[PDB]
Write a protein that holds these residues in place. Structure first.
Motif, PDB file in Angstrom:
ATOM      1  N   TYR A 116       9.041  12.716   1.590  1.00  0.00           N
ATOM      2  CA  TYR A 116       9.593  11.704   2.371  1.00  0.00           C
ATOM      3  C   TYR A 116       8.940  11.367   3.665  1.00  0.00           C
ATOM      4  O   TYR A 116       8.285  12.209   4.268  1.00  0.00           O
ATOM      5  N   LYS A 117       9.175  10.075   4.017  1.00  0.00           N
ATOM      6  CA  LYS A 117       8.833   9.085   4.963  1.00  0.00           C
ATOM      7  C   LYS A 117       8.046   9.672   6.027  1.00  0.00           C
ATOM      8  O   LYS A 117       8.241  10.822   6.364  1.00  0.00           O
ATOM      9  N   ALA A 118       7.130   8.824   6.532  1.00  0.00           N
ATOM     10  CA  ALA A 118       6.234   8.832   7.637  1.00  0.00           C
ATOM     11  C   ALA A 118       6.469   7.399   7.982  1.00  0.00           C
ATOM     12  O   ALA A 118       7.100   6.757   7.161  1.00  0.00           O
ATOM     13  N   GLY A 119       6.075   6.844   9.143  1.00  0.00           N
ATOM     14  CA  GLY A 119       6.407   5.457   9.374  1.00  0.00           C
ATOM     15  C   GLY A 119       5.324   4.617   8.791  1.00  0.00           C
ATOM     16  O   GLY A 119       4.362   5.174   8.267  1.00  0.00           O
ATOM     17  N   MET A 120       5.438   3.261   8.843  1.00  0.00           N
ATOM     18  CA  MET A 120       4.322   2.567   8.293  1.00  0.00           C
ATOM     19  C   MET A 120       3.996   1.314   8.993  1.00  0.00           C
ATOM     20  O   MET A 120       4.825   0.775   9.715  1.00  0.00           O
ATOM     21  N   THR A 121       2.741   0.860   8.756  1.00  0.00           N
ATOM     22  CA  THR A 121       2.066  -0.284   9.270  1.00  0.00           C
ATOM     23  C   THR A 121       2.253  -1.400   8.311  1.00  0.00           C
ATOM     24  O   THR A 121       3.379  -1.616   7.883  1.00  0.00           O
ATOM     25  N   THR A 122       1.171  -2.166   8.014  1.00  0.00           N
ATOM     26  CA  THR A 122       1.214  -3.283   7.098  1.00  0.00           C
ATOM     27  C   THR A 122      -0.070  -3.297   6.318  1.00  0.00           C
ATOM     28  O   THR A 122      -1.002  -2.559   6.632  1.00  0.00           O
ATOM     29  N   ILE A 123      -0.147  -4.132   5.253  1.00  0.00           N
ATOM     30  CA  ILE A 123      -1.334  -4.198   4.437  1.00  0.00           C
ATOM     31  C   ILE A 123      -1.675  -5.620   4.183  1.00  0.00           C
ATOM     32  O   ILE A 123      -0.844  -6.519   4.303  1.00  0.00           O
ATOM     33  N   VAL A 124      -2.955  -5.840   3.842  1.00  0.00           N
ATOM     34  CA  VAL A 124      -3.391  -7.112   3.372  1.00  0.00           C
ATOM     35  C   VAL A 124      -3.515  -6.881   1.906  1.00  0.00           C
ATOM     36  O   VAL A 124      -4.107  -5.889   1.485  1.00  0.00           O
ATOM     37  N   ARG A 125      -2.933  -7.763   1.080  1.00  0.00           N
ATOM     38  CA  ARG A 125      -2.980  -7.520  -0.329  1.00  0.00           C
ATOM     39  C   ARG A 125      -3.462  -8.777  -0.974  1.00  0.00           C
ATOM     40  O   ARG A 125      -3.232  -9.874  -0.466  1.00  0.00           O
ATOM     41  N   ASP A 126      -4.173  -8.646  -2.108  1.00  0.00           N
ATOM     42  CA  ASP A 126      -4.551  -9.820  -2.833  1.00  0.00           C
ATOM     43  C   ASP A 126      -3.296 -10.258  -3.497  1.00  0.00           C
ATOM     44  O   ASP A 126      -2.478  -9.424  -3.882  1.00  0.00           O
ATOM     45  N   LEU A 127      -3.067 -11.574  -3.647  1.00  0.00           N
ATOM     46  CA  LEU A 127      -1.847 -11.828  -4.333  1.00  0.00           C
ATOM     47  C   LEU A 127      -2.052 -11.451  -5.755  1.00  0.00           C
ATOM     48  O   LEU A 127      -3.162 -11.514  -6.282  1.00  0.00           O
ATOM     49  N   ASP A 128      -0.956 -11.027  -6.404  1.00  0.00           N
ATOM     50  CA  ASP A 128      -1.007 -10.515  -7.734  1.00  0.00           C
ATOM     51  C   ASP A 128      -1.209 -11.662  -8.648  1.00  0.00           C
ATOM     52  O   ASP A 128      -2.025 -12.539  -8.367  1.00  0.00           O
ATOM     53  N   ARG A 129      -0.507 -11.644  -9.802  1.00  0.00           N
ATOM     54  CA  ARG A 129      -0.663 -12.705 -10.747  1.00  0.00           C
ATOM     55  C   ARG A 129       0.555 -13.587 -10.793  1.00  0.00           C
ATOM     56  O   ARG A 129       1.466 -13.372 -11.590  1.00  0.00           O
ATOM     57  N   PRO A 130       0.599 -14.572  -9.935  1.00  0.00           N
ATOM     58  CA  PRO A 130       1.686 -15.506  -9.967  1.00  0.00           C
ATOM     59  C   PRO A 130       1.218 -16.708 -10.695  1.00  0.00           C
ATOM     60  O   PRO A 130       0.027 -16.811 -10.992  1.00  0.00           O
ATOM     61  N   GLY A 131       2.157 -17.611 -11.013  1.00  0.00           N
ATOM     62  CA  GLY A 131       1.796 -18.888 -11.538  1.00  0.00           C
ATOM     63  C   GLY A 131       1.123 -19.597 -10.403  1.00  0.00           C
ATOM     64  O   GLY A 131       0.218 -20.408 -10.590  1.00  0.00           O
ATOM     65  N   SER A 132       1.594 -19.271  -9.181  1.00  0.00           N
ATOM     66  CA  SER A 132       1.239 -19.853  -7.921  1.00  0.00           C
ATOM     67  C   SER A 132      -0.221 -19.771  -7.621  1.00  0.00           C
ATOM     68  O   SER A 132      -0.973 -18.953  -8.152  1.00  0.00           O
ATOM     69  N   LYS A 133      -0.618 -20.684  -6.715  1.00  0.00           N
ATOM     70  CA  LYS A 133      -1.947 -20.872  -6.218  1.00  0.00           C
ATOM     71  C   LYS A 133      -2.386 -19.647  -5.481  1.00  0.00           C
ATOM     72  O   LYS A 133      -3.504 -19.180  -5.701  1.00  0.00           O
ATOM     73  N   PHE A 134      -1.519 -19.072  -4.615  1.00  0.00           N
ATOM     74  CA  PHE A 134      -1.933 -17.910  -3.873  1.00  0.00           C
ATOM     75  C   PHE A 134      -2.380 -16.849  -4.826  1.00  0.00           C
ATOM     76  O   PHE A 134      -1.601 -16.282  -5.592  1.00  0.00           O
ATOM     77  N   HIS A 135      -3.693 -16.579  -4.780  1.00  0.00           N
ATOM     78  CA  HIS A 135      -4.357 -15.545  -5.509  1.00  0.00           C
ATOM     79  C   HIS A 135      -5.388 -15.117  -4.532  1.00  0.00           C
ATOM     80  O   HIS A 135      -6.582 -15.086  -4.822  1.00  0.00           O
ATOM     81  N   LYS A 136      -4.935 -14.797  -3.312  1.00  0.00           N
ATOM     82  CA  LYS A 136      -5.877 -14.439  -2.304  1.00  0.00           C
ATOM     83  C   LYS A 136      -5.221 -13.454  -1.405  1.00  0.00           C
ATOM     84  O   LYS A 136      -4.134 -12.947  -1.681  1.00  0.00           O
TER      85      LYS A 136
END
Lengths: 165, 359, 146, 178, 131
Positions: B42-62
RNA sequence: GGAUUAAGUGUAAUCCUCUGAAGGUGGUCUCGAGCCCUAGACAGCCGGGAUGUUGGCUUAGAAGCAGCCAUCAUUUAAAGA
RNA sequence: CAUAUCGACCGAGUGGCUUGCUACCUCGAUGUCGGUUCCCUCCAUCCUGCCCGUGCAGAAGCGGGCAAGGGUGAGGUUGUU
RNA sequence: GGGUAGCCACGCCACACGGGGUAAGAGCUGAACGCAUCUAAGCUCGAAACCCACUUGGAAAAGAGACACCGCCGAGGUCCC
């Protein structure tokens, strides 16, 4: 309106013009319809208009329920057939709450004794079986006049029977 | 009204145990079982991530930032003891166990190494009394003839290396959902003698519920309990007091309506946490990376929160709830409800933010 | 299990007519159970049966909170409750022969031996000129969650 | 009460109120249990049965039973089929049947000519034949008339729309044939 | 449609912000923002991306007085991202817009956010600067 | 013993208290009235709905069918201006 | 063109939010108006879902049915409601 | 004047569908009443509503539960630090 504490007889006499003044005039057009004079009585086809109830229709009740009646009697070409008769008149006067006589329900006011209700309207009363307003002619149609009174009834506090000729 | 707060969790007591106890387990077909359907550290605190967008129907794939969030330190954890349950009417009741002669050298506290002489306090799970078979036989016979119920295993997370933890391990039984039964019973037996990690039941992209007691203070007033309106100014100076609660025949009010009491604490699951990452602390890289035995991928410099540095097996559970907090113990699950379909074995994780918490 | 005295079937059977018997007999002393609660029927229906009963549309359940009262949802309780009516359940031989009666859920009765019908409280649901739609038991308690 | 004997060519054999039919077309079963009724038994000839009962109540039943049978008889030998045309305003409709009623299975496409296909369901043992030409006829048939019935229907109704008014648009498929 | 970017609501109703140009704009003050809900101690809310209804507090022309709408261009409160972590930057912001969504003022003073353009083009358009 | 009711109508003498006045039901039972029927009814049911001619007038139209007048004749198994 | 819609006269009701009546309850005292805060409910539904009709081309509506899951605010004058 | 941690919101993250049964309604097969009829038996669909799904609580549910292991002269637990 509405007529509620108006047509149930829980009072007794008068009309008496001596006693009362300021009576409103009736708004019930003539109680003689169709061609009068000649005895309509020679006719096939007969009558209607049976009250089947207790009483006191106001002139407001009869005068638009009767010419309403006549209106769809017009079908028989204006002046050509039947005579319409109305029976009873609106003599009977009613009074309504003028706060001075008694208390509680109408025909009672404020205080004790005192203002009887002030004159407001008149209504004829009828019995269980009386003919409110009748007359007929030969079977003009199936019975336009029978249709009349359909409308005639349906503006009476009572449930009127058509009654066959 | 709407009513303030929401009934649901009730009554809203404190929480017995500071360990979550999942009410329900995934139901499964085409399964092992896991034994450790649930598995957590269990837990440690956390920051944030940059992620590629997964596989949506959507345009965002970046590239897009999601809160790569509360990285929790897990695992490995060991399951010592698969426990059978068998026969109603009444409810589930334990059968007999299994064993294990491995005994993590720290599972004394809250376990073994109890004083041989009886102590007034009840003794925890300790065993030198062993009958591996007998337990096996008892279960098998009470399989064909009687019944059995879903079987689970004891588990205990070790604090091999976590900031400020000890031999104490507070673990609870997690159920194994295999196929028929007897197939699975075999499975929980194999993963008996032996140990596990997250990389077993788990997968990046896969959704999991998460459960843990909320952190929080003791009794407080109505306003920051279920929210209630404060004021009006009169008794404004005084604490927020809701209008009288119920008035009529029962003098007392059951209410279901705004009362002061404990808050904080909890025990509630979250549903459909995605698990963006899986991880470690050992260095592994597609290409050359820092050397000299660098550290875990995601732990902020300056450490994180009070209990810092991570250098071993991790998990990243985006949009961190976590349903509790700092250095407590969440339990993982499988996503029982599920909504969206699973994503992939891995996510791109283009960038992870490492920075001192302060600053 | 419970010791039966006279177990009674209750399939096509009007519920009250049955439980208006075993809750008489119960009173006298007799011990036992009706089975096939589940198929046990009361006439008049598919409306003011669903309602004024225990559906989640009846709103009998989910009726109130800390005041109650609550009703029942299972075919067992549903006409167990009927049994309490027609008994002075509160006290004395009331809650006595009361406890000493159980209704069992069941398809064909769970206990081995068919149990007797009562003085004619039977559906007679065949070419129901006198009959009409009457369906209850499980069905009422099926619209409602079990 | 009544007695129905028929037909040769099709067997009966009902036990414990299940009932049956036989062939050569496939068989249909129907529970037929209601109120003290015999639930007709085959009497070494054909099935027909009455229960000592009262007047109307049972009578409404053991009348209905008669009709359920005698339409189980003809649904086993020379089955039942309903047949009717599709057709309306511009652009045709696409009717086609893929196995099962399921969404994106049972036909209809461009109703007027809309997007998204709307159609279900199919009954247990009914066959959906298709148009003689591109599209201008449907045949629905099956042993039971109680599945075949609301298959062709529930395929007509699956054209019915509550919107503008039927008058303006007259799409849909109707089974005029009986 | 989707902002694709999380936003915290920096300014509530009665808030005073700066038009990044309309005509004779000045400082509008916030009145309820688009279809929005409420709760006890609601404090309506607003944030970059959400259309808002507003009144012109300052002014010059008889723009002052009121009616609106305008969209909040920038905000001081954090954001979100897709890549990094994001910013808050400038002061708050807002540009009046027509029901069409077009600006009712040729030039927009100040920068504008990227995923504000996505929600409404034309607003981003006469940006002058994005990011 | 007999009949009605399918609405849980109702299981409510009286009444501040028990409402209901001038929504629906080819479910079923009972009672009455009119007309039609073995010169064959209903279905009663099934099928069909002649020529001068759109009769004259009127009318924007007025073709069996707004209204007025007339209501003949032909071919008929039969069919009205 | 009664009945898309509007709909008088008269007749029958339901609710218990307004008002009045009771002078029945309390004058050895049931704390006022308005506001506020906090909970529950009613319909007889304003929106949303699924529908029917239209004086329904479409679009936008108008009227009606089922339905109470959720939703249904901020300010300027005035103590005001 | 600046501001660490923490706590916070004006900051950030997450909060379906789908399936089952219905209402209004649209239909199917179908009699009573040889026809017709969506209804009387039967059936296909069909609402933000109902049930499920999902989150939360929940062995004091008196039918007061189940399972595995440890243990009855020591398992565990309380106190203590």
């Amino acid at each position: 309106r509405p007529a509620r504490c108006y047509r149930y007889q829980k009072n007794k006499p008068y009309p008496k013009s001596r006693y009362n003044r300021a009576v409103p005039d009736s708004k019930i057009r003539i109680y003689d319809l169709g061609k009068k004079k000649a005895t309509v009585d020679e006719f096939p086809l007969c009558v209607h208009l049976v009250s089947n109830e207790l009483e006191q229709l106001s002139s407001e009740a009869l005068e638009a329920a009767r010419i309403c009646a006549n209106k769809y009697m017009t079908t028989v070409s204006g002046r050509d057939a039947f005579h319409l008769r109305v029976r009873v008149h609106p003599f009977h006067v009613l009074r309504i709450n003028k706060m001075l006589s008694c208390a509680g329900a109408d025909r009672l006011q404020q205080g004790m004794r005192g203002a009887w209700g002030k004159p407001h309207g008149l209504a004829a009363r009828v019995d269980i079986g009386q003919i409110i307003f009748s007359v007929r002619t030969k079977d003009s149609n199936k019975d336009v006049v029978v249709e009349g009174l359909r409308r005639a009834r349906y503006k009476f506090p009572g449930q009127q029977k058509i009654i066959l000729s | 009204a709407p009513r303030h707060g929401h009934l649901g969790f009730l009554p809203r007591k404190r929480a017995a145990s500071i360990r979550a106890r999942v009410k329900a387990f995934p139901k499964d077909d085409r399964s092992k079982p896991v034994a450790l359907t649930s598995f957590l550290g269990y837990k440690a605190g956390m920051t944030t991530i940059v992620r590629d967008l997964d596989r949506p129907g959507s345009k965002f794939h970046k590239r897009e930032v999601v809160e790569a969030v509360t990285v929790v330190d897990t695992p490995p954890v060991v399951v010592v003891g698969v426990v059978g349950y068998v026969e109603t009417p009444r409810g589930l009741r334990s059968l007999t166990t299994v064993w294990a002669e491995h005994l993590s050298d720290e599972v004394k506290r809250r376990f073994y190494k109890n004083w041989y002489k009886s102590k007034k306090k009840a003794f925890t799970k300790y065993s030198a009394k062993y009958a591996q078979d007998g337990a096996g036989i008892e279960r098998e016979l009470a399989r064909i003839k009687k019944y059995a119920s879903v079987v689970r295993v004891l588990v205990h997370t070790q604090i091999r290396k976590t900031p400020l933890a000890q031999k104490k391990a507070h673990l609870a039984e997690i159920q194994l959902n295999g196929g028929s039964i007897s197939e699975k019973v075999d499975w929980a037996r194999e993963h008996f003698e032996k140990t596990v990690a997250v990389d077993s039941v788990f997968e990046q992209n896969e959704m999991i519920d998460a459960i843990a007691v909320t952190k929080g203070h003791g009794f407080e007033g109505v306003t920051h309990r279920w929210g209630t309106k404060k004021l009006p100014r009169k008794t404004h100076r005084g604490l927020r007091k809701v209008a009288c609660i119920g008035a009529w025949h029962p003098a007392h009010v059951m209410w279901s309506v705004a009362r002061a009491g404990q808050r904080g604490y909890h025990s509630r699951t979250s549903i459909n946490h995605k698990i963006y990452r899986v991880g470690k602390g050992d260095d592994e890289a597609n290409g050359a990376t820092s050397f000299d035995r660098t550290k875990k991928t995601i732990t902020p410099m300056g450490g994180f929160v009070h209990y810092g540095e991570i250098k071993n097996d991790f998990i990243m559970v985006k949009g961190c709830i976590p349903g509790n907090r700092k250095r407590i113990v969440t339990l993982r699950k499988s996503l029982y409800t599920n909504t969206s379909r699973k994503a992939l074995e891995e996510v791109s994780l283009k960038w992870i933010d490492t920075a001192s918490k302060f600053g | 299990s419970v010791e039966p005295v006279v177990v009674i079937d209750g399939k096509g059977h009007l519920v009250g007519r049955l439980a208006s018997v075993v809750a008489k007999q119960l009173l006298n002393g007799q011990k036992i159970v009706v089975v096939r609660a589940e198929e046990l029927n009361i006439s008049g229906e598919f409306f003011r049966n669903k309602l004024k009963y225990h559906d989640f549309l009846r709103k009998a359940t989910a009726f109130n909170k800390t005041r109650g009262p609550f009703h029942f949802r299972a075919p067992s309780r549903i006409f167990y409750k009927a049994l309490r009516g027609m008994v002075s359940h509160k006290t004395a031989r009331g809650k006595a022969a009361l406890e000493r009666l159980k209704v069992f859920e069941g398809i064909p009765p769970p206990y081995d031996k068919k149990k007797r019908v009562v003085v004619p409280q039977a559906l007679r649901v065949l070419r129901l000129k006198p009959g009409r739609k009457y369906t209850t038991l499980g069905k009422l308690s099926t619209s409602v969650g079990w | 009460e009544q007695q129905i004997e028929v037909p040769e060519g099709v067997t009966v054999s009902i036990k414990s109120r299940i009932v049956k039919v036989v062939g050569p077309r496939g068989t249909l079963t129907k529970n037929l249990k209601h109120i003290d009724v015999t639930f007709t038994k085959v009497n070494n000839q054909l099935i027909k049965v009455a229960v000592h009962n009262g007047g109307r109540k049972h009578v409404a039943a053991l009348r209905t039973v008669k009709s359920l049978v005698d339409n189980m008889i003809t649904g086993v030998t020379k089955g039942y089929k309903y047949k009717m045309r599709y057709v309306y305003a511009h652009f045709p409709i696409n009717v086609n049947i893929v196995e099962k009623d399921g969404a994106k299975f049972i036909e209809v496409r461009n109703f007027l000519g809309d997007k998204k296909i709307r159609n279900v369901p199919v009954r247990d043992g009914v066959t959906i034949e298709f148009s003689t030409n591109v599209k201008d006829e449907i045949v629905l048939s099956g042993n039971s008339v109680e599945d075949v019935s609301q298959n062709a229907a529930d395929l007509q109704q699956i054209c019915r729309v509550r919107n503008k008014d039927i008058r303006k648009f007259l799409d849909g498929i109707y089974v005029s044939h009986k | 449609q989707g902002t694709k970017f999380r936003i915290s609501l920096g300014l509530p109703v009665g808030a005073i912000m700066n038009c990044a140009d309309n005509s004779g704009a000045r400082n509008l003050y916030i009145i309820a923002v688009k279809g929005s809900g409420s709760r006890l101690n609601r404090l309506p809310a607003a944030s970059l991306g959400d259309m808002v209804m507003a009144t012109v507090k300052k002014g010059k022309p008889e723009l002052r007085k009121k009616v609106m709408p305008a969209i909040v261009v920038r905000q001081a409160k954090s954001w979100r991202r897709r890549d990094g972590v994001f910013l808050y930057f400038e002061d708050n912001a807002g540009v009046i817009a027509n029901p069409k969504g077009e600006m009712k003022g040729s030039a927009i003073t100040g920068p504008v956010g990227k995923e504000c353009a996505d929600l409404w083009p034309r607003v981003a358009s006469n940006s002058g600067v994005v990011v």
